[PDB]
Amino acid sequence: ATLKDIGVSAGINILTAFIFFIIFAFLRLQPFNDRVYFSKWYLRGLRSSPASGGGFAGRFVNLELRSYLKFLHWMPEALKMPERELIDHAGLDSVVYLRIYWLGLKIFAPIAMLAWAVLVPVNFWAHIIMAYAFTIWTCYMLMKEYETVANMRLQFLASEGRRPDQFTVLVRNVPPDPDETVSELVEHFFLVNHPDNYLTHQVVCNANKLADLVSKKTKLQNWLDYYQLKYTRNNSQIRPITKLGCLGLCGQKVDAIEHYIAEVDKTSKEIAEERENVVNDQKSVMPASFVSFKTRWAAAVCAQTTQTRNPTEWLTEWAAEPRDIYWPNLAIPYVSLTVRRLVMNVAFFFLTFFFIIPIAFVQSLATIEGIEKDFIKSLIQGLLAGIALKLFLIFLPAILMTMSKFEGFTSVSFLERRSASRYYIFNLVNVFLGSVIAGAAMAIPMKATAFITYIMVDGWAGVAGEILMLKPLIIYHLKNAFLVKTEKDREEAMNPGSIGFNTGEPQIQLYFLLGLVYAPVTPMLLPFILVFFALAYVVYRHQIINVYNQEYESAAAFWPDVHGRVITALIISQLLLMGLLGTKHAASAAPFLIALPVITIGFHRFCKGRFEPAFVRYPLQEAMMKDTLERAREPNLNLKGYLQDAYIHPV
Amino acid sequence: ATLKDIGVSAGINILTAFIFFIIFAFLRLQPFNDRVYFSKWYLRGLRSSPASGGGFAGRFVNLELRSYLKFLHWMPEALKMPERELIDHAGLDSVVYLRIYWLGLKIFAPIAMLAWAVLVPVNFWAHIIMAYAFTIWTCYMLMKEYETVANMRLQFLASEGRRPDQFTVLVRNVPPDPDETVSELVEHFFLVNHPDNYLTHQVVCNANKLADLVSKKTKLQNWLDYYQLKYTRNNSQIRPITKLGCLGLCGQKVDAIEHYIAEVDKTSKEIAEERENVVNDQKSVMPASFVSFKTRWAAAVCAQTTQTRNPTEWLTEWAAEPRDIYWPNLAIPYVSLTVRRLVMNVAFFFLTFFFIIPIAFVQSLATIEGIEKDFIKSLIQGLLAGIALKLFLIFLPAILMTMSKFEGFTSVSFLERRSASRYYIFNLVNVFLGSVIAGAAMAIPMKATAFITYIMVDGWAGVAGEILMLKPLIIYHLKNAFLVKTEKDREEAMNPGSIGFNTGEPQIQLYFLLGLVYAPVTPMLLPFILVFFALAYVVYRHQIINVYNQEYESAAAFWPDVHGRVITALIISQLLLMGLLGTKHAASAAPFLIALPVITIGFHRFCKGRFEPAFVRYPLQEAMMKDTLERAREPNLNLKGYLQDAYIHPV
């Protein structure tokens, strides 16, 4: 745990990152990897073909250009696009996600300077003085960013083009009537209670079975489009087990091509059948609808007003953009939502515990490998531990997403925000306070050196490996080698994906926690946490501009969540110092360290009353302004046309 | 503290109450006291003159009719009026205030039976079992009453006649503009943002000086209408000190009549001056207005929607009925409200402490009188202590009201609810946990016997003295003897007042606290608490029907507050038993007594999501129904006429 030990591991992790950048340089120069490394430009119609014609030079013919700005030149170029241009290139969501990395640099750089000028040089009421200073600074910076992001969201919303969700609401829990269909009920309610501005509605149907059948047919056609063009004629005789196709030569059914072609044809038959049934039954129709209005002002009124005396019926909320709608969860009974949430809350409790064991044992196998085996030894025993941690936790965002989908959120945006909130609690317990303490199948917040190696593995070399985009590269390459069957591009496996708020934001928040909690005590984690923020800003800006494509636009609606998690980190820090310098210390240290959490909570409440309203409520003056200006620019728009078929199930 | 000691004091307090009922009988038979004891009937136009012609028989000629139903016959007669008739005689507010006494009887009677059948007969995990049972019962009964009162409020609101507040909102914090008056700003905002339904507005002015001058003139005219008709001609030569008139022969200025008549005339001159100034200046105009709408639906929309992007400007809330408006506080800058609230919060902290000292010393002077002086001795030493407590605390509701008026609430209803909330905190600390513990200029919740005597003094003999209405009787009699100058009634000093939510409800809640906290431990306070609830139901029903007149109609809007205070009592009880049977006891007692508060909080949250919405939000379907039915019954109403001058300052 000496400076030299940490310095050796730092060099290793820095070299790994630089090696990743050298491989990135090579791979991005290859003309056949252009659609993976520059996918956003292809999606924005600003890039044409792999090499201005397709697959030409830049490859192994010239390898790379050995220097310094041959593998690190993408960095200054990622910082060139102005933020305004990036709001219109990528989106507001992505631009404000980048601002969380910048917030970290603005919060932790001054606090690291203070900790490396007060603590270490004179190495104590200074611990409590610094704690105050650190909290004041973090809060000032949080307030300034709450303001900026609120104003950005408001400007974006005012200039955003017509989207169907600006006029629509989702009415849920429409009370059942024996003589009226959901559609009739909905129409009548909104023609009597919102008489002047109701335009149209779209009842939610359960086309989940039909959707599943359509997806099966794509999988069945894709599965053996491969073995239909492996060599055509009499192709493969793969014989998997009977479950979901998959496997391959692990059962008995040899046969031939197109996933036994009859399979695709029988799926198509069941699709036709279900298409008739789901349209003609009214049993598929759910007690919910998507009600659209003539104005955005009216939709705002509906979204923020109570409709009936029963607080659980006619529940109106702003609808999501039709591309953000997670349609499978719109067919879940509202009654089940509460129980589903409870079941997933208790499964989350078990998940946490299960993982504590592996993490403690990750650190245990580190010591065990040490036993099995000086500089090198310690180095590897520590690094390997962090790699194990990373491997166990790359599997966490996916589990948390399935749990969020079970709970029943009907928007991809909200699912990603719930998954990020749950990951914070996992990180609060298992990657922090309650990990080594919950060992055995004083020492609550673990130890500095263990955390340092994780910051260097997950947040230095891990963020560098993100730029290499290996998983998407492999997938594209396998798709374009096996299931190609295209003249050129009718095979789009270029799908880049989004930033991954449910994965990326929890990482930022773990380093915000680590940084804030340890700062008054030790000043050692801070330098490593700062390199994360800077590297990640530049790697993610490059990826937001060149690769990732947003799947929704929430206009930074996640900011209240991000803010609240940094406030939590601040509070946890203060509480931990009231346990370190609360024991004995001074009698006057107690009132100081007890006022800090009160000030922080009061600040949070001020920010929730000044800046949070911009994210949770749409002002009616803003809505009216948008409406009036649109009705002047486009004096005659048929909004009924645009809004009617906007919320039909994609199938 | 023996049963006999408590029994002796019970008899004394019961006799005091019966003596009060015998005096009441006499005084209510006197024909000259009819306008004090039957004031509500005179106010409802259902009673004519003191003795069907005025001042005739029933007095000392026949005294009273010595029996049992001569002084206790008013009790069955108070219980005769059906509740529906009482909603239309007195109001919903008063009918649901009576239901808190009935809630107490429905909560504590079954729990007293259990405590007197589980505890004492077998006098322990029974303490923890009973605690569970008591909480389940209290919660069941709270949920049932939340439902009933919600449905009552909703039915009342649907049948309530046109009141100006059903169409009006109070916009606060209208942003200042250099070229526009508040009126112009308000009109323009609501004609562009609520275009179809804005009707009219009424800007708030500061006519506080004018109001004060008008009130001074009434006091100056009244002061010596007395000494102008004491004997007319050359009357009194009273010479008070120079401050606020008052006193009398305690200074120098002898002179003569009409408070030195010139005084009334000079006040009238200043009134005329201020009348010109306040109307013609626009400096008196405050940044607030009362905006009325064409429909109640539109006003509901405005009240429950955000208007602008600045969360502290254009703040709209339902207006109060013009008679509920506390006009002096509408002229307080919004900026000052926060600081005023803080100053009064810290003054409340000091108030509590100041009083702890007297209460501890109240029960110290009890012991000291004991020392100065067997059955009689103990009896008086205890009773006198309770009387002292009552005397120190009759002065608390008034202080708490001035504190609420300082904070800046602009409705008498809200002022009474804030004063009742503050009195709960006073009672939680000083008349309970933190009184003897905060002694000296284990034993947190004081002791049973001390509380028992207070229940019997404040809640038995105190509620009986309420029926006697002595203060209002004295005032009327002095007014009609001194400042009469009427042919018959142009002198209305019959003002009965209201129930006093700021005084009466905190008493109910102190006995709910005492009852709930002590119940699992001891079963002794419960019988006395139950007599309070029953006596108070009957005394207050009589007074709601015969005497008290409501000054506002909130349609039971205070119920969420009442509910939450019984939930607090429940939680405090559980926490106290986790301190009594948490110490040692069992290891399995801890998980049981730790789940109880969680269940109680979960119940509260369920009730806040199911039944609280009816009190805090006006459904839009309900508003539309009221509007449509009114527009059919009265097809052509000029609402502008009715709403325009409704919110002008009464001066």
Side-chain angles (χ1 to χ4, degrees), chain B residues 319-359:
Chain B
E321 204 180 358
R323 64 168 175 155
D324 192 35
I325 308 264
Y326 187 59
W327 297 91
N329 282 358
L330 226 351
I332 296 185
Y334 205 89
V335 237
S336 203
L337 292 189
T338 27
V339 215
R340 283 169 169 260
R341 259 128 228 203
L342 209 121
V343 164
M344 262 3 190
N345 262 273
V346 312
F348 185 58
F349 159 78
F350 283 110
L351 232 205
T352 7
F353 280 13
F354 269 98
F355 270 82
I356 335 204
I357 324 151
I359 297 151

Coordinates of all heavy atoms in Angstrom, one line a residue, chain B residues 319-359:
Chain B
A319 N -58.4 30.8 -3.9 CA -58.6 31.9 -3.0 C -59.5 31.4 -1.9 O -60.2 30.4 -2.0 CB -59.2 33.1 -3.7
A320 N -59.5 32.2 -0.8 CA -60.4 31.8 0.3 C -61.6 32.6 0.1 O -61.7 33.6 -0.6 CB -59.7 32.2 1.6
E321 N -62.7 32.2 0.9 CA -63.9 33.0 0.8 C -63.6 34.4 1.3 O -62.8 34.5 2.2 CB -64.9 32.3 1.7 CG -66.4 32.6 1.4 CD -67.3 31.9 2.4 OE1 -66.8 31.1 3.3 OE2 -68.5 32.0 2.3
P322 N -64.2 35.4 0.7 CA -63.8 36.7 1.2 C -63.9 37.0 2.7 O -63.3 37.9 3.2 CB -64.8 37.6 0.4 CG -65.1 36.9 -0.8 CD -65.1 35.4 -0.5
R323 N -64.7 36.2 3.4 CA -64.9 36.3 4.9 C -63.8 35.6 5.7 O -63.6 35.9 6.8 CB -66.2 35.8 5.4 CG -66.5 34.4 5.1 CD -67.7 33.9 5.9 NE -68.1 32.6 5.6 CZ -68.8 31.8 6.4 NH1 -69.2 32.2 7.6 NH2 -69.1 30.5 6.0
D324 N -63.1 34.7 5.0 CA -62.0 34.0 5.6 C -60.7 34.7 5.4 O -59.7 34.4 6.1 CB -61.9 32.6 5.0 CG -61.1 31.6 5.7 OD1 -61.0 31.7 7.0 OD2 -60.5 30.8 5.1
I325 N -60.6 35.6 4.5 CA -59.4 36.3 4.2 C -58.9 37.1 5.3 O -59.7 37.9 5.9 CB -59.6 37.2 2.9 CG1 -60.1 36.4 1.8 CG2 -58.2 37.8 2.5 CD1 -59.1 35.9 0.8
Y326 N -57.7 36.9 5.8 CA -57.1 37.7 6.8 C -56.4 38.8 6.0 O -55.3 38.6 5.6 CB -56.1 37.0 7.7 CG -55.7 37.8 8.9 CD1 -56.6 38.3 9.8 CD2 -54.3 38.0 9.0 CE1 -56.1 39.0 10.8 CE2 -53.9 38.8 10.1 CZ -54.8 39.3 11.0 OH -54.4 40.0 12.1
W327 N -57.1 39.9 5.9 CA -56.5 41.0 5.1 C -55.2 41.7 5.5 O -54.5 42.1 4.7 CB -57.6 42.0 4.8 CG -58.8 41.5 4.0 CD1 -59.9 41.0 4.5 CD2 -58.9 41.6 2.6 NE1 -60.7 40.7 3.4 CE2 -60.1 41.0 2.3 CE3 -58.1 42.0 1.5 CZ2 -60.6 40.8 1.0 CZ3 -58.5 41.8 0.2 CH2 -59.7 41.3 0.0
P328 N -55.0 41.8 6.9 CA -53.7 42.4 7.2 C -52.5 41.7 6.7 O -51.5 42.3 6.5 CB -53.7 42.3 8.7 CG -55.2 42.6 9.0 CD -55.9 41.8 8.0
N329 N -52.5 40.4 6.4 CA -51.3 39.6 6.0 C -51.2 39.5 4.5 O -50.2 38.9 4.0 CB -51.4 38.2 6.6 CG -51.0 38.2 8.0 OD1 -50.6 39.2 8.6 ND2 -51.1 37.0 8.6
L330 N -52.1 40.1 3.8 CA -52.0 40.1 2.3 C -51.1 41.2 1.9 O -50.7 41.3 0.8 CB -53.4 40.3 1.7 CG -53.9 39.3 0.6 CD1 -52.8 38.5 0.0 CD2 -55.0 38.5 1.1
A331 N -50.8 42.1 2.8 CA -49.9 43.2 2.5 C -48.5 43.0 3.1 O -47.8 43.9 3.3 CB -50.5 44.5 3.2
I332 N -48.1 41.7 3.2 CA -46.8 41.4 3.7 C -46.0 40.9 2.5 O -46.5 40.1 1.7 CB -46.8 40.3 4.7 CG1 -47.6 40.7 6.0 CG2 -45.4 39.8 5.1 CD1 -47.5 39.6 7.1
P333 N -44.8 41.5 2.2 CA -44.0 41.1 1.1 C -43.7 39.6 1.2 O -43.4 39.1 2.2 CB -42.7 41.9 1.3 CG -43.2 43.1 2.0 CD -44.3 42.7 2.9
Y334 N -43.7 38.9 0.0 CA -43.4 37.5 0.0 C -42.0 37.2 0.5 O -41.8 36.1 1.1 CB -43.6 37.0 -1.4 CG -44.0 35.5 -1.5 CD1 -45.3 35.0 -1.5 CD2 -43.0 34.5 -1.7 CE1 -45.6 33.7 -1.6 CE2 -43.3 33.2 -1.8 CZ -44.6 32.8 -1.8 OH -44.9 31.5 -1.9
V335 N -41.1 38.1 0.2 CA -39.7 37.9 0.6 C -39.6 37.8 2.1 O -38.8 37.0 2.6 CB -38.9 39.1 0.1 CG1 -37.7 38.6 -0.7 CG2 -39.8 40.1 -0.6
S336 N -40.4 38.5 2.8 CA -40.4 38.5 4.3 C -41.0 37.3 4.8 O -40.6 36.9 6.0 CB -41.1 39.7 4.8 OG -40.7 40.0 6.1
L337 N -41.8 36.6 4.1 CA -42.5 35.4 4.7 C -41.6 34.4 5.2 O -41.7 33.9 6.3 CB -43.5 34.8 3.6 CG -44.7 35.6 3.2 CD1 -45.6 34.8 2.4 CD2 -45.4 36.1 4.5
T338 N -40.5 34.0 4.4 CA -39.5 33.1 4.9 C -38.9 33.4 6.2 O -38.7 32.6 7.1 CB -38.5 32.8 3.8 OG1 -38.4 34.0 3.0 CG2 -38.8 31.7 2.9
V339 N -38.4 34.7 6.3 CA -37.7 35.1 7.5 C -38.7 35.2 8.7 O -38.3 34.9 9.8 CB -37.1 36.5 7.3 CG1 -35.8 36.7 8.1 CG2 -36.9 36.8 5.8
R340 N -39.9 35.6 8.4 CA -40.9 35.7 9.5 C -41.2 34.3 10.0 O -41.3 34.1 11.2 CB -42.2 36.3 8.9 CG -42.2 37.8 8.8 CD -43.4 38.3 8.0 NE -43.5 39.7 8.1 CZ -44.3 40.4 8.9 NH1 -45.1 39.7 9.7 NH2 -44.3 41.7 8.9
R341 N -41.3 33.3 9.1 CA -41.5 31.9 9.6 C -40.3 31.5 10.4 O -40.6 30.8 11.4 CB -41.7 31.0 8.4 CG -43.1 30.7 8.1 CD -43.5 31.0 6.6 NE -44.8 31.7 6.5 CZ -45.5 31.7 5.5 NH1 -45.2 31.0 4.4 NH2 -46.7 32.5 5.5
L342 N -39.1 31.8 10.0 CA -37.9 31.4 10.8 C -37.9 32.0 12.1 O -37.6 31.4 13.1 CB -36.7 31.8 10.0 CG -35.4 30.9 10.2 CD1 -35.0 30.3 8.9 CD2 -34.3 31.8 10.9
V343 N -38.1 33.3 12.2 CA -38.1 34.0 13.5 C -39.2 33.4 14.4 O -38.9 33.2 15.6 CB -38.3 35.5 13.3 CG1 -38.7 36.2 14.6 CG2 -37.1 36.1 12.7
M344 N -40.3 33.1 13.9 CA -41.4 32.5 14.7 C -41.1 31.1 15.1 O -41.6 30.6 16.1 CB -42.7 32.7 14.1 CG -43.5 33.9 14.6 SD -42.6 34.8 15.8 CE -43.8 36.0 16.4
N345 N -40.3 30.4 14.3 CA -39.9 29.0 14.6 C -38.9 29.0 15.8 O -39.0 28.2 16.6 CB -39.3 28.3 13.4 CG -40.3 27.4 12.7 OD1 -40.4 26.3 13.0 ND2 -40.9 28.0 11.7
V346 N -38.0 30.0 15.8 CA -37.1 30.1 16.9 C -37.7 30.7 18.1 O -37.3 30.3 19.2 CB -35.7 30.8 16.5 CG1 -35.2 30.2 15.3 CG2 -35.9 32.3 16.5
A347 N -38.8 31.5 18.0 CA -39.5 32.0 19.1 C -40.3 30.9 19.7 O -40.6 30.9 20.9 CB -40.3 33.2 18.8
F348 N -40.7 29.9 18.9 CA -41.5 28.8 19.4 C -40.6 27.9 20.2 O -41.0 27.4 21.2 CB -42.1 28.0 18.3 CG -43.0 26.9 18.8 CD1 -44.1 27.2 19.6 CD2 -42.7 25.6 18.4 CE1 -44.9 26.2 20.0 CE2 -43.5 24.6 18.9 CZ -44.6 24.9 19.7
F349 N -39.3 27.8 19.8 CA -38.4 27.0 20.6 C -38.2 27.6 22.0 O -38.3 26.9 23.0 CB -37.1 26.9 19.9 CG -35.9 26.6 20.8 CD1 -35.6 25.4 21.2 CD2 -35.0 27.7 21.1 CE1 -34.6 25.1 22.0 CE2 -33.9 27.4 22.0 CZ -33.7 26.1 22.4
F350 N -38.1 28.9 22.1 CA -37.9 29.5 23.4 C -39.2 29.5 24.2 O -39.1 29.2 25.4 CB -37.5 31.0 23.2 CG -36.0 31.2 22.9 CD1 -35.6 31.6 21.7 CD2 -35.1 30.9 23.9 CE1 -34.3 31.7 21.4 CE2 -33.7 31.0 23.6 CZ -33.3 31.4 22.3
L351 N -40.3 29.7 23.6 CA -41.6 29.6 24.3 C -41.7 28.2 25.0 O -42.0 28.2 26.2 CB -42.8 29.7 23.3 CG -43.9 30.7 23.5 CD1 -45.1 30.2 22.7 CD2 -44.2 30.9 24.9
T352 N -41.5 27.2 24.3 CA -41.6 25.8 24.9 C -40.8 25.8 26.2 O -41.3 25.4 27.2 CB -41.2 24.7 23.9 OG1 -40.7 25.3 22.7 CG2 -42.4 23.8 23.6
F353 N -39.5 26.1 26.1 CA -38.6 26.0 27.3 C -39.2 26.9 28.4 O -39.3 26.4 29.6 CB -37.2 26.4 26.9 CG -36.5 25.3 26.3 CD1 -37.1 24.2 25.8 CD2 -35.1 25.4 26.1 CE1 -36.4 23.2 25.2 CE2 -34.4 24.4 25.5 CZ -35.0 23.3 25.0
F354 N -39.5 28.1 28.2 CA -40.0 29.0 29.2 C -41.1 28.3 29.9 O -41.1 28.0 31.1 CB -40.6 30.3 28.6 CG -39.6 31.4 28.5 CD1 -38.9 31.7 27.3 CD2 -39.3 32.2 29.6 CE1 -38.0 32.7 27.3 CE2 -38.4 33.2 29.5 CZ -37.7 33.5 28.4
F355 N -42.1 27.7 29.1 CA -43.2 27.0 29.8 C -42.8 25.8 30.6 O -43.4 25.5 31.6 CB -44.4 26.9 29.0 CG -45.3 28.1 29.0 CD1 -45.1 29.2 28.3 CD2 -46.4 28.0 29.9 CE1 -45.9 30.3 28.4 CE2 -47.2 29.1 30.0 CZ -47.0 30.3 29.2
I356 N -41.8 25.0 30.1 CA -41.4 23.8 30.9 C -41.2 24.2 32.3 O -41.6 23.5 33.2 CB -40.1 23.1 30.4 CG1 -39.8 23.4 29.0 CG2 -40.2 21.6 30.7 CD1 -38.9 22.3 28.4
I357 N -40.4 25.3 32.5 CA -40.1 25.7 33.9 C -41.4 25.9 34.7 O -41.5 25.2 35.7 CB -39.1 26.9 33.9 CG1 -38.1 26.7 32.8 CG2 -38.4 26.9 35.2 CD1 -37.5 28.0 32.3
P358 N -42.3 26.8 34.3 CA -43.6 26.9 35.0 C -44.3 25.5 35.2 O -44.8 25.4 36.3 CB -44.4 27.8 34.2 CG -43.4 28.8 33.6 CD -42.0 28.2 33.8
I359 N -44.4 24.6 34.3 CA -45.1 23.4 34.5 C -44.4 22.5 35.6 O -45.1 21.9 36.4 CB -45.3 22.6 33.2 CG1 -46.2 23.5 32.2 CG2 -46.0 21.3 33.4 CD1 -45.9 23.2 30.8

